[PDB]
Amino acid sequence: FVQPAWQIVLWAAAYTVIVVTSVVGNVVVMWIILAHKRMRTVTNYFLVNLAFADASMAAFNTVVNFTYAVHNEWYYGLFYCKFHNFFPIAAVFASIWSMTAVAFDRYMAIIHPLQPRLSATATKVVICVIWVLALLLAFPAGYYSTTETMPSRVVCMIEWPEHPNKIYEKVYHICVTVLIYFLPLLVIGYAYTVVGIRLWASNIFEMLRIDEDEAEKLFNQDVDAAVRGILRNAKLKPVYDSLDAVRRAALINMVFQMGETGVAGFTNSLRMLQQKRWDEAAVNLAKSRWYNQTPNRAKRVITTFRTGTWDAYHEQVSAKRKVVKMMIVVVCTFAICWLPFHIFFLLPYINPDLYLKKFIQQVYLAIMWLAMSSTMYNPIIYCCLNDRFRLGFKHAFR
Ligand SMILES: C[C@@H](O[C@H]1OCCN(Cc2nc(=O)[nH][nH]2)[C@H]1c1ccc(F)cc1)c1cc(C(F)(F)F)cc(C(F)(F)F)c1
């Protein structure tokens, strides 16, 4: 029953913010990639499709969807009634599956580099298929939309054929919710977790392979035998228990080079690590005869004890790591923005009366604002994280 003018003008301002920031931002992003085109990569060519879909939904739907919510009267006739219910499903499908396409491309490059699935001509075919499938799934929702003429007003509502329980409308609604949200988010989730583990994480067998024609190494057995020996030694066991997985590997790396008895000698450095004085321990171990003879290896073991990370056994300036951080943020934004929207339309199946009660109009306006804002965050994410994109937007200033 809450209907104040002070609120309506305030909402329209918050809503127009979406339209302006989504058209400007995404067109600049489209521009940056498409021309120069000295930056036209498989990942970026997909991002262009996502930039189009975003700027597109914002132009067409934000205006029409806000007016109807506020006024409860359809002003744009049967054609735009059908179109405003068709295009959002097509635009959301094309966006989420373009995101998946970038995830597949990174996975195939990080995980399977010998098999190349990157092709210029094919990218256009993928973007082509994405849109064919998108407009097909959106079609039934557009088909059944119609305007009912009444004495006081014109109403835009979607009415499916009269079935004994009208199961088709519900099934379709559920399927759309899967293809547009749950299914691709699961797929994107899987790729970036495997790729996340490969780019950031490592292990003792990888470490020992680096630090240590000719036969192959036999670490598999020796690593478990090194662990058994450390837990037998009274000078080494307490230190080892206090250490995390990454630091435990640094201690075993040394036992592999000097041996249990040799490593047991660094009494002070070992009491420092136990006490968790990483920087202090790192300074002391650098003064050893171990460091003087093998500085490169010793520098790697020391920096592992100090940082508690695999940073020493991975390239310093990594461009592959920057893009994955960007894309993960973009996906998590989508997931956050669309969840209340999907829950909102999913509830009439649990409690039908709960929806047609209280002042849900103020809620639907808050829920619909978040969903539509997903359309503007992407250019901001590209500038906040990536070096070239922020220089590109900087170049678009007069
Ligand atoms: C067109 C509209 O659809 C909803 O409003 C009408 C009823 N409709 C249930 C229905 N009954 C049918 O028979 N067909 N659809 C709703 C619905 C349909 C599919 C869903 F997954 C969730 C809700 C819609 C869809 C999305 C999308 F695509 F993101 F979901 C985004 C937006 C916007 F952002 F512009 F507000 C608007």
Author numbering: 25 to 226, 1001 to 1010, 1017 to 1117, 237 to 321
What does the study report here?
To provide static characterization of cognate ligand recognition by NK1R and modulation of ligand binding by the residue in position 2.50, we determined the crystal structures of two human NK1R variants, with aspartic acid or asparagine at the 2.50 position, bound to the antagonist aprepitant. Aprepitant (2-(R)-(1-(R)-3,5-Bis(trifluoromethyl)phenylethoxy)-3-(S)-(4-fluoro)phenyl-4-(3-oxo-1,2,4-triazol-5-yl)methylmorpholine; also known as MK-869 and L-754030; Merck & Co., West Point, Pennsylvania), is a highly selective NK1R antagonist. The NK1R structure consists of a canonical 7TM helical bundle with three extracellular loops (ECL1–3), three intracellular loops (ICL1–3), and an amphipathic helix VIII. The crystal structure of NK1R bound to aprepitant provides a detailed static picture of how the receptor interacts with its antagonist.
To improve receptor stability and facilitate crystallization, three mutations, Y1213.41W, Q1654.60A, and T2225.64R, were introduced and 10 residues (residues 227–236 of NK1R) of the third intracellular loop (ICL3) were replaced with a modified T4 lysozyme (mini-T4L). The optimized NK1R protein was co-crystallized with aprepitant, but the crystals diffracted to only about 6 Å. The resolution was improved to 3.2 Å by replacing residue E782.50 with aspartic acid. The two structures are similar, with an overall Cα root mean square deviation (r.m.s.d.) of 0.4 Å. However, relatively large conformational differences of residue side chains were observed around the 2.50 residue. In the NK1R structure with the E782.50D mutation, residue D782.50 forms a hydrogen bond with N3017.49 (2.8 Å). Our data show that mutant E782.50D retained the ability of stimulating SP-induced Gs and Gq signaling as seen with the wild-type receptor, while mutant N3017.49Q exhibited reduced Gs and Gq responses to SP. In contrast to the two single-residue mutations, the double mutation E782.50D/N3017.49Q, which may benefit from the recovery of the hydrogen-bond interaction, preserved both Gs- and Gq-mediated signaling. When the mutation E782.50D was introduced, the fluorine peaks P2a and P2b (−63.1 and −62.9 ppm, respectively) remained separated. Comparing the NK1R structures with different mutations at position 2.50, we observed structural differences in the helical bundle around W6.48 and Y7.53 region, especially in the NPxxY motif, suggesting that the conserved residue E2.50 may regulate receptor signaling via the hydrogen-bond network of this region.
